[PDB]
Amino acid sequence: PKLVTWMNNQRVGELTKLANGAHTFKYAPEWLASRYARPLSLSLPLQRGNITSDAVFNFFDNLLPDSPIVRDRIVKRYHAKSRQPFDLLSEIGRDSVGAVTLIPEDETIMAWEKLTEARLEEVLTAYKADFRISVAGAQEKTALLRIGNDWCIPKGITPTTHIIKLPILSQSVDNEYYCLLLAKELGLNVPDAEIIKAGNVRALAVERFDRRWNAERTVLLRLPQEDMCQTFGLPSSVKYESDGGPGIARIMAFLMGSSEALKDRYDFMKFQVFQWLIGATQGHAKNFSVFIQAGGSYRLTPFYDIISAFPVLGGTGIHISDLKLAMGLNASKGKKTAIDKIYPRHFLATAKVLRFPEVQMHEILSDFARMIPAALDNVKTSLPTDFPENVVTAVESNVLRLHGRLSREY
Numbered sequence: 530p531k532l533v534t535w536m537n538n539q540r541v542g543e544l545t546k547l548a549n550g551a552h553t554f555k556y557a558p559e560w561l562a563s564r565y566a567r568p569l570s571l572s573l574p575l576q577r578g579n580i581t582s583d584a585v586f587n588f589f590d591n592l593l594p595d596s597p598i599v600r601d602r603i604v605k606r607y608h609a610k611s612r613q614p615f616d617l618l619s620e621i622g623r624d625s626v627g628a629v630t631l632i633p634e635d636e637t638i639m640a641w642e643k644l645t646e647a648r649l650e651e652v653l654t655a656y657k658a659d660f661r662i663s664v665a666g667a668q669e670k671t672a673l674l675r676i677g678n679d680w681c682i683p684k685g686i687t688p689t690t691h692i693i694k695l696p697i698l699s700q701s702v703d704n705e706y707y708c709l710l711l712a713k714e715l716g717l718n719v720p721d722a723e724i725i726k727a728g729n730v731r732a733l734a735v736e737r738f739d740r741r742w743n744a745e746r747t748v749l750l751r752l753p754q755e756d757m758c759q760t761f762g763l764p765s766s767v768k769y770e771s772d773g774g775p776g777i778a779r780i781m782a783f784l785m786g787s788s789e790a791l792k793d794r795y796d797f798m799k800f801q802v803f804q805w806l807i808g809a810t811q812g813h814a815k816n817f818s819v820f821i822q823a824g825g826s827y828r829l830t831p832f833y834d835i836i837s838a839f840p841v842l843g844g845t846g847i848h849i850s851d852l853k854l855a856m857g858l859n860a861s862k863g864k865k866t867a868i869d870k871i872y873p874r875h876f877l878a879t880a881k882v883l884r885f886p887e888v889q890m891h892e893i894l895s896d897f898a899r900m901i902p903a904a905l906d907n908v909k910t911s912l913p914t915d916f917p918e919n920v921v922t923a924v925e926s927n928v929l930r931l932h933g934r935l936s937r938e939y
């Protein structure tokens with residue numbers, strides 16, 4: 530059938546699934562007529578006819594969790610017609626990443642339901658074992674609306690405000706909380722987050738940057754954005770560079786066209802050094818996104834889904850020398866990927882071939898060189914008393930070891 534695509538009460542167009550299985554999208558005339566029109570994706574440019582490219586299927590598929598196990602749970606929950614994407618979005622497409630609201634064609638203000646601690650625990654635990662929310666991730670996360678100090682279920686098409694993550698890596702909630710705090714302390718653009726507790730559940734609540742309250746707090750708006758697989762028209766299956774996905778060079782080139790090119794290229798390169806320092810090995814293409822602005826211009830969103838592989842070291846069998854960056858750097862004979870083998874020279878060499886000013890690359894390295902020690906100390910003040918000590922020890926010790934390569938040079 531057809532899923533009507535809305536962006537904050539404005540009709541954008543309709544998604545169709547053909548009898549032959551193909552997915553097509555058509556923009557609404559009224560959307561195309563606006564002087565402030567913007568495409569749903571840079572892979573789906575504004576145009577009048579039916580769009581039938583694989584970019585249509587890929588774009589909407591990328592709104593859903595990557596995991597087949599998670600999709601099975603979704604079908605079971607809402608009695609979805611099938612496992613196919615169009616049918617999943619027919620059930621949970623009301624509140625998605627970005628501003629796309631999908632509502633069945635056979636269907637015709639701000640309100641919410643406050644959750645008691647008991648009902649919150651109930652709602653959240655239900656995920657490990659008016660609620661049509663879809664979240665893009667690797668595990669099974671959901672979303673809720675925060676009103677003051679209470680967690681709530683939005684009614685109708687009222688949006689959510691926070692992405693909620695449960696433990697994966699049994700300490701992933703604590704791991705990400707720590708990494709988000711550290712990134713913020715070092716000047717990176719990342720969302721604020723908090724550890725929430727509902728009875729026996731411990732989850733991470735991350736503020737959404739694809740949502741914005743108006744000044745009077747009477748309307749909560751959704752903000753359009755898409756991830757790198759979506760912008761390049763790619764399936765989530767190629768999110769890693771080794772599978773054909775975009776790496777540093779492709780993304781840096783794309784950012785030359787951002788409405789904030791200078792700042793975004795600098796922030797993206799700074800984030801590569803940060804990931805190296807904290808041992809983040811899952812910085813694939815879906816971990817980066819851009820806001821789509823009026824007319825189709827774009828700029829990088831904050832970074833997110835940040836987790837260190839350091840707390841997983843030793844434990845089973847993973848060794849420090851086994852940790853690799855998802856997006857490799859330039860090396861004299863190819864690429865440099867091992868965190869334990871990377872030095873300032875690799876970042877400078879990468880900057881050189883990508884036309885990123887050497888003075889800017891030096892500034893980034895020198896800033897981490899003098900700020901890291903104090904930043905690791907400052908984060909402690911924001912950790913609860915029940916925060917796992919092994920996570921702090923693992924990350925701190927390894928960050929300091931690599932930081933030594935920066936301080937010696939700067």
Ligand SMILES: [Cl-]
Pocket residue numbers: 864865866867870
């Ligand atoms: Cl290497």
